[PDB]
Amino acid sequence: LTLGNTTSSVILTNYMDTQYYGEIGIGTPPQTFKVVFDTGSSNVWVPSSKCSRLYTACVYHKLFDASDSSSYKHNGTELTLRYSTGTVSGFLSQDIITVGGITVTQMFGEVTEMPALPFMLAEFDGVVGMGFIEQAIGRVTPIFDNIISQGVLKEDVFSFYYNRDQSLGGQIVLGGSDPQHYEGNFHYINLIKTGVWQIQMKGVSVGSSTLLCEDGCLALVDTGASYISGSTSSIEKLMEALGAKKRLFDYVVKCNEGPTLPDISFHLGGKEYTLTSADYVFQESYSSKKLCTLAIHAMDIPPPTGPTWALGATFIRKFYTEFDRRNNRIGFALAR
Numbered sequence: 001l002t003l004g005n006t007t008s009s010v011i012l013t014n015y016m017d018t019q020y021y022g023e024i025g026i027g028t029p030p031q032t033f034k035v036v037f038d039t040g041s042s043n044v045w046v047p048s049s050k051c052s053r054l055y056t057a058c059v060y061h062k063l064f065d066a067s068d069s070s071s072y073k074h075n076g077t078e079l080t081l082r083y084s085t086g087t088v089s090g091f092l093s094q095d096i097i098t099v100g101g102i103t104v105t106q107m108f109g110e111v112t113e114m115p116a117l118p119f120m121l122a123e124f125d126g127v128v129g130m131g132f133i134e135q136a137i138g139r140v141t142p143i144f145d146n147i148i149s150q151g152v153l154k155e156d157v158f159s160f161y162y163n164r165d166q167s168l169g170g171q172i173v174l175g176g177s178d179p180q181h182y183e184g185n186f187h188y189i190n191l192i193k194t195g196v197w198q199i200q201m202k203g204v205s206v207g208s209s210t211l212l213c214e215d216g217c218l219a220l221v222d223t224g225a226s227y228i229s230g231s232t233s234s235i236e237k238l239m240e241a242l243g244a245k246k247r248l249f250d251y252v253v254k255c256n257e258g259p260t261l262p263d264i265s266f267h268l269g270g271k272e273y274t275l276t277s278a279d280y281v282f283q284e285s286y287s288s289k290k291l292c293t294l295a296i297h298a299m300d301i302p303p304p305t306g307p308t309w310a311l312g313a314t315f316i317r318k319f320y321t322e323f324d325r326r327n328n329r330i331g332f333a334l335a336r
């Protein structure tokens with residue numbers, strides 16, 4: 001590992017508190033794409049001009065045209081990326097990617113199959129996986145590993161700031177942290193193992209009692225996830241305690257009850273990470289005649305990573321997060 005004296009920041013747009021995306025340039029001249037930076041995955045992909053227009057998501061998104069890039073290098077190996085929310089399929093290509101001023105030669109997926117559900121709901125075009133090579137489909141070197149290889153970054157770390165919505169939507173710092181977006185000190189939690197941004201969780205409290213994860217559990221710290229998620233079983237118990245009602249894809253409370261809900265605490269490392277109802281309820285009205293969604297849902301993550309909780313944007317909004325590759329740990333500080 002070679003270290004430089006450079007930090008690079010990526011400005012993010014906050015779409016409805018669920019999607020936080022930045023811009024990347026691909027090829028020569030650059031073709032620009034809106035992308036989510038996801039610590040829960042390790043591949044880079046954007047939709048391809050080779051995507052049949054029968055996929056309406058390809059009609060509505062920006063497409064990479066290899067035929068317009070003089071720096072493109074063919075590969076063609078088939079790739080399928082199976083996310084918990086949906087799947088994309090396509091093939092590998094190589095080109096120059098610009099992210100926050102840094103330019104890097106990167107192998108990425110050109111997606112030719114992009115299902116209308118959920119991708120018609122994506123404000124972003126593609127994803128930049130911020131995970132480790134161990135989780136990369138096709139053993140493709142992830143972009144942060146390629147950026148580290150350049151020996152320009154001051155530190156082998158990257159940090160996320162997600163705003164709560166003229167205001168900055170969010171910010172990723174490659175090579176450091178931005179003290180303008182946090183306060184107090186970082187408290188670090190070591191990874192269970194290298195290869196996954198996952199830490200041990202010692203308990204989940206709903207009110208003053210630890211009713212969940214009593215004997216310990218896992219927490220994936222997932223920047224690409226919109227919500228906090230737990231297994232169906234853990235979430236059924238959490239929601240029972242909140243008095244929330246299960247719907248198809250989410251949980252709801254009567255809008256008037258939203259401000260009465262208890263605090264939820266996540267026991268990580270030596271500290272309690274507390275969210276008040278204002279942090280996890282999408283409070284759209286105070287009406288006793290309307291239902292308000294919660295920013296916590298059930299998601300059964302399969303083994304070897306799962307069963308696990310995932311601390312997505314709901315969590316990161318309250319806690320500025322540093323992902324430390326040099327020391328295999330995650331730091332949290334109160335977001336400012």
Ligand SMILES: CCOC[C@@H](CC(C)C)NC(=O)[C@@H]1CNC[C@H](C(=O)N(c2ccc(C(C)C)cn2)C2CC2)[C@@H]1O
Nearest residue numbers: 040041081082083084085118119121122127224225305
């Ligand atoms: C196979 C490569 O994936 C690895 C896998 C491992 C996990 C389960 C531990 N990784 C994952 O499953 C991802 C982990 N991080 C959140 C991601 C996400 O939710 N996405 C998402 C967000 C919004 C929408 C909208 C269109 C509403 C669609 N997708 C984006 C990455 C696509 C995926 O769940």
Ligand SMILES: *[C@@H]1O[C@H](CO)[C@@H](O)[C@H](O)[C@H]1NC(C)=O
Nearest residue numbers: 073074075076077092107140
């Ligand atoms: C695609 O990249 C892999 C990885 O190095 C390589 O082994 C393979 O030969 C490439 N395929 C083509 C056709 O370029």
